[PDB]
A paper describes a structure:
3D classification of the images resulted in seven distinct maps of the enzyme, each showing the complex in a different conformation. Initial 3D classification produced three classes, each of which appear to show a ∼120° rotation of the central rotor within the F1 region of the complex (blue arrows), similar to what was seen previously with the S. cerevisiae V-ATPase. The state 1a to 1b transition reveals a bending of the peripheral stalk towards the top of the F1 region near the [name] and F6 subunits. While MDFF with maps in this resolution range cannot be used to determine the locations or conformations of amino acid side chains, loops, or random-coil segments of models, it can show the positioning of α-helices in the structures. Figures 3A and B compare the fitting for state 1a and state 1b, illustrating the accuracy with which α-helical segments could be resolved in the maps of different sub-states. Fitting of all available atomic models into the density map is shown for state 1a (A) and state 1b (B). Instead, the differences in conformation between sub-states when taken together illustrate the flexibility of the enzyme, a property that has been linked to its rapid rate of enzymatic activity.
In the mitochondria of eukaryotes, adenosine triphosphate (ATP) is produced by the ATP synthase, a ∼600 kDa membrane protein complex composed of a soluble catalytic F1 region and a membrane-inserted FO region. In the mammalian enzyme, the subunit composition is α3β3γδε for the F1 region with subunits a, e, f, g, A6L, DAPIT, a 6.8 kDa proteolipid, two membrane-inserted α-helices of subunit b, and the c8-ring forming the FO region. In addition to the rotor, the F1 and FO regions are linked by a peripheral stalk composed of subunits [name], d, F6, and the hydrophilic portion of subunit b.
Author numbering:
A (entry chain G): 56 to 61, 67 to 96, 101 to 219
B (entry chain T): 1 to 58
C (entry chain I): 1 to 47
D (entry chain H): 15 to 145
E (entry chain W): 10 to 226
F (entry chain K), G (entry chain J), H (entry chain Q), I (entry chain P), J (entry chain L), K (entry chain O), ...: 2 to 73
Amino acid sequence: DIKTPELIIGVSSDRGLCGAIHSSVAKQMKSEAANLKEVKIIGVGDKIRSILHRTHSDQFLVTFKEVGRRPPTFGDASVIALELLNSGYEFDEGSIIFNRFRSVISYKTEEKPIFSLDTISSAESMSIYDDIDADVLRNYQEYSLANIIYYSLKE
Amino acid sequence: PYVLGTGLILYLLSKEIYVITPETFSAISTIGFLVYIVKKYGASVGEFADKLNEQKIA
Amino acid sequence: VAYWRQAGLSYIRYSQICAKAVRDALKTEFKANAMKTSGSTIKIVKV
Amino acid sequence: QMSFTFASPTQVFFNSANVRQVDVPTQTGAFGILAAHVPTLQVLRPGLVVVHAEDGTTSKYFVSSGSVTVNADSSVQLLAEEAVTLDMLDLGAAKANLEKAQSELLGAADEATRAEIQIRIEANEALVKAL
Amino acid sequence: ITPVILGLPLVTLIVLFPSLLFPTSNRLVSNRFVTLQQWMLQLVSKQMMSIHNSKGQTWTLMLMSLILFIGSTNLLGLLPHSFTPTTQLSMNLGMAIPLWAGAVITGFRNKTKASLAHFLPQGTPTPLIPMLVIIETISLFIQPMALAVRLTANITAGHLLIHLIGGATLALMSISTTTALITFTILILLTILEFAVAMIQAYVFTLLVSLYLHDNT
Amino acid sequence: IDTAAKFIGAGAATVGVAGSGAGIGTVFGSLIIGYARNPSLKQQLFSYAILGFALSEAMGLFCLMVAFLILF
Amino acid sequence: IDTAAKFIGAGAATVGVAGSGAGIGTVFGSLIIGYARNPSLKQQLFSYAILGFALSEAMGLFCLMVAFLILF
Amino acid sequence: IDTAAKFIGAGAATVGVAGSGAGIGTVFGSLIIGYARNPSLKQQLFSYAILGFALSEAMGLFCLMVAFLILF
Amino acid sequence: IDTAAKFIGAGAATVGVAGSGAGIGTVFGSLIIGYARNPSLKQQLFSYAILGFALSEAMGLFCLMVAFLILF
Amino acid sequence: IDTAAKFIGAGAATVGVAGSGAGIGTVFGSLIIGYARNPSLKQQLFSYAILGFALSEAMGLFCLMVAFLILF
Amino acid sequence: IDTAAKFIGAGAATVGVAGSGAGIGTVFGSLIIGYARNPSLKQQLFSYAILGFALSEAMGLFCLMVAFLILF
Amino acid sequence: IDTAAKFIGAGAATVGVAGSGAGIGTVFGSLIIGYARNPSLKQQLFSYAILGFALSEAMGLFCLMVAFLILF
Amino acid sequence: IDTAAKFIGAGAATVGVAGSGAGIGTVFGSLIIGYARNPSLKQQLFSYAILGFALSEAMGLFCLMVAFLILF
């Protein structure tokens, strides 16, 4: 477990002409969005840019284009991950909104939270879930952001 | 530069007033003084730039 | 602060340069998979 | 025992497999991952995964990077960005790559440039380790 | 008379010029002169203030006067010879009371019976044992205050041994130089390792002691 | 003998200052390798550096007290 | 001889305080490295540092007892 | 010759405690830094620090018996 | 002289147990920090601590043979 | 005795420089293994190394003045 | 004088085995924490421990060669 | 007396060179573990190790000068 | 006095080999705890171990040349 008093980001496909994937995320990002401090949003895919754009023309941080129509890769995951880092937006508590596939009959737009802070991970009992550096932490925080990104992307 | 020269003079005086050293004592100290000079003047010029700029800024 | 982490460099970045090197490594056969992974056709929509 | 989950994006090599121990080239350096585990986080370097599977058999890999995740649990998770069995790498090539790496370094002259090149050197060299 | 009488005035005066010159620099001139000398207290207000406050401005300047006085007193013991063996030593004993009084000002003055109640209630001194508090009051002040005299006498010893071993090396090999130059070359470098280090650590004692003053102030 | 042994006995207690001078090298060493781990440099670690160099110089000031007692 | 060797023996026992002095630095240094790893400073680790300064000053009080017995 | 050398024999035999006090600081330091990595404190590891502080004082009772032999 | 130098000489050889005393605290100290890294306690690690306390008390047994050669 | 044991008393006072020499090795070693973690070379870790080698040879200048008192 | 100073001078050379015994606890202790990070037990690590203890007890066998040359 | 205790005064002054020898290993051994974390060899750590070898062998030079003082 | 003090004057200079004895154990021990972090064993680390062992037997080449000067 991690926490913050504080990268809300959703994951969508580039294109529509598929389900309510977009709708979901579009919805559920915004659904959140009121609650939190450092309100800033990131959209991967654009069938979210195309719906979550209305005023997310203003509250996106960056947005990412191509997703599907080119199958996702770790490689990619790293890319979007990378620049994402460089940005003073990190956690407002980050969350990742993606479509968790479950079955062809169901997916659930799922979300997780992205602790984009090493720092409280430094804090807490998380202190000794590691017992080894706010360095490498970050480089995992990193890595897992990519891993998840990849993952998310694929789901 | 002027300060440094004054400090050296003062020094020589205290030697002269007290019983003359064993020659060595003086040789080592004077050499020890010498070594700093060559670095020091390069530092001393640099010192000026820092503060008078920080003074000028405020 | 590794040459890269003190190049600032993301561990991702580092890592990716590694991966890139993996692709660099391997054999022809397995180079197929290089492109299978890798990359990004994505574009940073800067907004 | 340790349930070793050794996976890469591409595949799962070991999946919570009762491997006794795995020796990894964390960026910490080497590391001998044993049956249960510390809560520890580790970063992977270009070196080898030698997966001492609780059966004497040990598989080798060279892993470039990624994470090992060292749980309080006996569950160990190597998530290697890529960790490949050396099997699919080629020594001859390695040399060639390393050469290049070393060639490049010499003109690597932004810290980053140097660093990446150095990654190559380091890496390529590190392939040579076990190639 | 004159020899001791000229030395202590010299001591005072070298600290007095910096301590007078900086007050002066607060509007004129500066030309070469005032700005040049302002670097003296700018080096104090640069160097020593990197450690000071810390304890707080309140007392800061009270100590920094002693810190500068110590270093300036050593510097006045640093090119006069004969002077290190006498004037720095007479000044080390003249700095001896100031070092004692530096813990006095807030520690022993506010609590003599337990200046470790101001310095360190729980730590080295056992707070369960007021006896060890008073005993380690020596180990944290009475002896450290004697060790601060020794600490300047450590500079005096290391500076002096350079001289003596010089003295003895150029006396042993009065060749002009010649082979004594090899050892005397070392004995020169020894000036840095002994005096310039210990001289430092001597003012570091004044720094820390008076840190411990105003840090508990 | 009566005047000889006091001089030979003062130096022998001055060899007990070899334990305090290395115990200060271990306490300030493990604080120099205890500040690299970061980040509470002021307080906690370097505040207990003088608290670890007080009990280790306590063996030196007691030993140099037994060396001075055979001299005065 | 008899009033002489008591001064050239009580001083050699003060060289036994070299382990008490360098033992206090090592037990506290690794306590400064153990509290740099965090977080149980208040009891558990620094509480055991008192149980390490006692079992290290005991080999310094027993050595100071033999030095005091050959002097008084 | 007979009355004197026994006083300068138990004095140099007290310089064998300089290891029992510093070695106890080494073992109790490694248990102070060892428990930091956690979690076997009330078992396993601190039960091995008692087995270490004894073997270190085992050359501190063997050395102390020689200084008690030359005296009485 | 004949009964004097063998009584003060047997005391100087007892300063060879200061090495085995602190040398036993380190080999049992690194085994406390080693089993903290876990988990091959019985066999391998704690079976090597006997091989490390035997090669350290071998110089102790070599030093306790010297002090007993001038005592008997 | 008077003009003899003070020459063998300045030899025993120079054994106190085994702590100022082995304390510098412990200090200027942990500031080499600590800078390996990086990147606080100037202003922090090596600045504290000046205050680490200040309380290390402070027991050595106090041991070089004890031998200087048994000569001049 | 010619036989007396040969019995109390062979005892001062037995204090040179204090380095071979404390050094052996450092050459084996740094091998205990070495194989704790593992895994090269036989060969590489323990092979380097044998070439290290041989260079640690060499200052113990040469010091017992200057001890036995003063008594035999 | 004048020629006798000057020979036993230079020998105990040579025991003050036991801090520089063990200081040399603990300063060039922490840099042997510094480059193990890598990669500042011939940059920062190996450059400061020479500045660590000089601060420790100087306390061996200031002790060998006392041994040469009581020999010529 | 002349020949008598030359026997208990090279024996006190033989206890200076305790710094080189444990200094070689601290140097080679750090190399055993360094190649365990791997992998620059061949050259870089073990090649630097021959630079640290020579700079530790350098004090052993200056302390054994002292006791061999008071012999013949």
